[model samples]
Target: GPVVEKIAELGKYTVGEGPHWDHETQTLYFVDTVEKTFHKYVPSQKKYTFCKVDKLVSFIIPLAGSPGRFVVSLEREIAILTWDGVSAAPTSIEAIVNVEPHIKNNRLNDGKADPLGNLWTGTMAIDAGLPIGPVTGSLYHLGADKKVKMHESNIAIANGLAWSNDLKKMYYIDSGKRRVDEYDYDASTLSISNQRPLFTFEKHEVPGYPDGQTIDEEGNLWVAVFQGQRIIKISTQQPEVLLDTVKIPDPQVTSVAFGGPNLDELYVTSAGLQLDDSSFDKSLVNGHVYRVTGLGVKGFAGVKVKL
Candidate 1:
């Protein structure tokens, strides 16, 4: 069981997504993908601020055991956002790999670090409009050596990603397909196989499609339901059994992360830009990072990407 509460609000966030908790920094990093805005939140002092990026920032991963350096997925490139070792703020960005340099309409989307410290992210067409928008998105993997490999292609919207606690399986979401998929994973070689569907949803089944997600200690998947206005906690073991549900007032709930000192806090992100005036609530803070507690659960300390 989890209870939801609004914590803090950043600026005009169009799609506040990618919530990540840095245990070393004791802070949370997230983004408003549509606005290309990045944000940082320190829970202890209730501090919150944001930075603007020149390109769409799909997701970010803090380099494991390395302070101040991060692997970020910018529109067409996988780059490192570097800091001066003392400050959390980024000082410069260096491209590690270029993905689909020839495709002008695709942009990177959701991504995460595997247990072995490798990063995996995917891209989608800038405009998802049918007829005009084709399934041209592709998935990429980046190792510590800074080399990139293409994983899958022809995807519509690559979204949520998570690895099993045992490090043998990967759960993925291609939102356009309305399905969550699982793959056989090799921890040593960092390879995926046996691609199959874990579950699929009909349009009427959810408020919206799946967005970003995280895994809990017991191996359940907590997924954000964009435009659906809720977070669904699904059990991989049971597949279709719904374990928990977190309903937010906003229609565009984007991503979630397990944060705070004890790692008991569940942080949720949302958006205000998608709603109409009739749906937007001015009385309450919209597009703010929300915290859900009383879960009676702990989260897996996520693996950091090795730079």
Candidate 2:
């Protein structure tokens, strides 16, 4: 537990997720998957802006050694986008690889780059949380050569993802299962094996399911617990320990990223969706972004996924 702060109020982005801090520009990027919107906030200027896309925008990562270009996961495929700093919008968008065209209703969720430049991402059924839906989701790795391969399958809601500081292990969250799993990572071939559960949230112990995750300089995993209204920091050592917590009032805290000049402040994203429309608050701020400070910890810069 530490001092937390609410930064600027972004738009009413429904189901905001994947907060990523661009150290180069000091801008924090995130998305509203349900709304097909891409957002960025400049803490230095107190400026925030958004761009509406044609497809569901899940996550985007800067390309390795490339400043204005990025790799994006849009619904069922992987694509490329060139950002025009002048327009504050994507200059060009092109489809690169398509996976599961036959699987009708699944989309990619959370993903990040390995230190060696390969990208790892996962998918979930569009109706995954509903009763009639089956757990047919899967995970995929998009190599630097533009080859997309299935890594794991039969997942429910493939969510949080992060690699250890040393790049020797990878951690992930299948929200539907209430547990975070780990894998032995091979940087050379960009493979993950030796699957095992690293963190399992007991019904009462883990207030909510994990969503998105990020790593700190200490190799600690900080995960956003949706409907749990908090971010939990856990060590990566043997018998992982809960290091700290950053509490939020919004129940839809979706993901987190460390930003600010020193990477000491944590930028968090949340969903504003009150699915019933009759349940609770309708204020736009419910879906706004949050910045937590005074944590006294530094985070590692995300590894750029190779193009």
Candidate 3:
């Protein structure tokens, strides 16, 4: 069992997306997509900080060997951002690559760096409104050489991603599809193949679309469910099993990651943008970040992207 509590002091987010734990610095980094802001919180010092971006910022991955440099996805461009911990904005942002330059209504979504240091991210179409437009989104891989490769196409809402403990498998979630898919991974060649569905909300009668995901040290997958008000834990072994579920106060649970000194604390992000008409109590902690404890499990620290 797990206990969920909100960190009210940090405030709320319009659409909190990415939650990345940097064990090297023992800090938790996340982004507010709708607000175009990047946030960092240090538990030890009781400090919270953020910087505003000019465009919609989806995720931020710290560079492997560089301390103050990061790879950030701003709208359609993958760029490098240099910032000091206390700055109000990044000192510089240099574009490394522009994805889907021809698509006027697309933007990068959730992303994560693989164990091998390659950056994996995806895009979604936002032509008309909140529900998202068409299936023009696609998954991409950014290599160490700064080359970009498209892996999957015709996706709707490209979201959560996680790698197996053994580094031989990858798990992905497309919110529009309401399913979790697995792919055979090759660290040596930086490739993925054999796409297959590992679990589906329709099959399990789950209520929400999956968002961000992370794997525990034991290889169990912890998934944040948007509009579901819960985080579900699933086994990655054959005949994948539903191991546990942690209910959240916010209906739009966006992302989750392992943080804290021992990597035993689960930090969660949520969205407050569209909860106006939801049946859940609107006065509850809708967009505030949450912390879950007593899980008796730990997770590996996030891997930095290799420059």
Candidate 4:
């Protein structure tokens, strides 16, 4: 008995993408691709604070050892902010990855932090006239100790990430294709092994590629489908879609987050940057966020371990 609702109208966001729900604050955060802005909304107060960064910012993560926010690699190199969560400039912003010299047009896209406060991000090679993920990108992790490590390689585009409810498996998606892979994870040491495809969309006739994903208490995966105009819920074994919904004018459902006073509300974000002018203008709900309330399973808010 999922009660889906469109509670708010975010006309300001150009292309809303990554959505991170904060349990402690009962707030939800999202990023706009075109404007490079991040928004924090509190439904109870109806307060939406806005912040901006020039990079093609993709994701947001709560900081560790402090009460602030942090974001990962997107279009350039950066680590977690030392102090500035939303008000001040990034504590540090440097090109940790010199992709401009090698890939030329590729840029860092989406990322999230592990429970231990490590940043995990991915890159995609997208140049005008060139296909996306043409130059297989890799995944990088920024450890709490300020050390940078590349976890895996030969990947098309490391878009989505998830961990099992028991924290025994790592779920990954290469947005270039429809395959969702799972890796054996060692939470104690933050190492992953046994990379295998748990599910591939070719089996379900996916309308679009899987863009972002999150896991619930029951270990089921919820994935946003870019160019599909739907959010898909699937079990790890076969990726049998449990539910799918029609989006607004555009079909690019970008990301999702689950939260609320009761942690039962599912908020999904969509993108219109890939749409043409006429198509986007006619869209009644494109580039905005939607929510599904009640029933279904709930997901844990991804926050850094307290130091």
Candidate 5:
């Protein structure tokens, strides 16, 4: 709750969603959906180092087992980009989870790698906030061979995926229903079972449910509360609130990633569509990006989805 105030003026971005800190470069990588581009921000320069892309890139992360290589989910597929913060070259991309074949109006939403280097990604309806199309958007694990295996389905939005500190349990959330579920994990075999509800948004509607999530060194779950105006840190140990309200004055709290050498700086991504010119007039800060410092713990770096 103590993390507040604008640390920088990032001008304005279009549906700025996923953000990650590249510790090696001491910079931040992020997306601007409406603009369909990705960028890097270096703190020392107090300047933005940009990389151009053609598709709607949502999340950015360093390559698994490779330095400086990053992968992001695009509207059509996952695009791998090599970055120096200026010119990013697309390495390769493939259809995300074969989801493109089944749904017409859905896009791959938030995702992260498990400790075993499995790409744990989710799909959601493009029409969010309201139930549309198949409420049963699914989850997938893109494995080593590029074969995507269906992990879970018949739900609402698959907002995020995370692992506990010991990698003994896997937490998956269907934000649309406001519940985060946990399952047994056999890390060696990459198998999961014994699904159970860990937390439900029974407290209140809580704005946009839970957007993006990460587990800390202490196993605390920090989630971005879309439209809720805050990111909540819950102790996985107790599965209750530790820091219940870290406020962000924006309309959409898209996702949050812990970065920096200390992993104490929290990078948040947000988006608010100017659905109509009228609403746009009042919510000018919609679709912006923000960063928060003085965080409590570090998070595990995401892994690659392997078969």
Candidate 6:
């Protein structure tokens, strides 16, 4: 069993996403994608800090061997941002490369680094209001050489990504698909193959679309279900087992990451947007980060971008 509590110390985010636990610094990083802000929190120091970006900042990953430098997804471009922890704004933002350059309506979404330090990110059509527009998204791989390669297309709402500890499997979620897919991953070549469905929300009777995900040290996956008001822990093996479910106070749960000194704490992010008048509750605190404890499991540290 797990006990979940909101981190009221941090301000609520509009569309909270991309929770990454940096083990090296014992810090948690996440982004308010719609608000165009990047945030950091240090539990040891009881510190919560954030900086605004000029564009919709989807995700941030620390650069390998670079303390103050980070790789960030700004709208359609992948950029490097230099920020001092205490600053209100980043010192500089330099574009390393842009994805979907020809598509004006798409932006980068959830992303994470592989065990080998390669970045795997995806894009989605900008909110067109509704039952999610066409499949205009695609998954990409940004290699150590700084080259980008497209791996999958025809995706809508490209979201959540996690790789197995053994480096043999990659699990991904395209929210529009309402399912999680697993792929055969080759760490040495930085490639994925044999894409197959692992589990589907429709099959399991899960209410919401799957958004962001992370893996436990034991290779099981914890997935955030948007509009489901819960994050589920699912077995990596077949037969679709639901190991655990952590009920969230808010319906629009967005992402999850394992943080804290021992990598045993589960941090969750949620959204306050798109709540209709009927479903919106004035007293319910939406769009805030949450911390889940007593799970009796641990997670691996987030890998920094190798570039």
The per-prediction tally of clashing pairs is 1, 0, 0, 0, 6, 0
lDDT of 6 by residue, 2-85 (tens): 789888888688899998889988998889989999989998888999999878888989999988999999999999999886
**Cα lDDT tens digits for candidate 3, 154-232:** 7888899999978899999888888889999988887889999998787777786899999999988999988889999
lDDT of 5 at 64: 66
Model 6: residue 53 alpha-carbon error in angstroms: 1.3
Models 1 onward score TM values of 0.90, 0.92, 0.95, 0.84, 0.85, 0.96
Name the weakest run of 10 consecutive residues (lDDT summed) in model 4. Answer: 276-285
lDDT of 4: 0.67
How does each model score on lDDT?
0.78, 0.79, 0.87, 0.67, 0.68, 0.88
lDDT of 1 by residue, 182-212 (tens): 8898888878899887766662376567888
Root-mean-square deviation per candidate: 2.9, 2.4, 1.7, 3.5, 3.2, 1.6
Better of 2 and 5 by TM-score: 2
Work out how many backbone clashes candidate 6 has: 0
What lDDT tens digits, residue by residue, belong to model 2 across residues 231-262?
Answer: 88887885456777778867778899999999
lDDT of each residue in 20-94, candidate 4, tens digit only? 877877878777756767777777777776675676777766655556645444565654443243463555543
Clash number for model 2?
Answer: 0
Pairs with backbone N, CA or C atoms under 3 Å apart (clashes), candidate 5? 63-69, 119-305, 143-306, 143-307, 144-306, 144-307
Regions of model 3 farther than 4 Å from truth: 127-132, 275-281
Q: Candidate 5: where are CA atoms >4 Å away?
A: 7-9, 65-68, 88-99, 131-133, 240-243, 275-281, 301-307
Candidate closer to the true structure by lDDT (higher is better), 2 or 6: 6
Candidates sorted by lDDT, descending order?
A: 6, 3, 2, 1, 5, 4
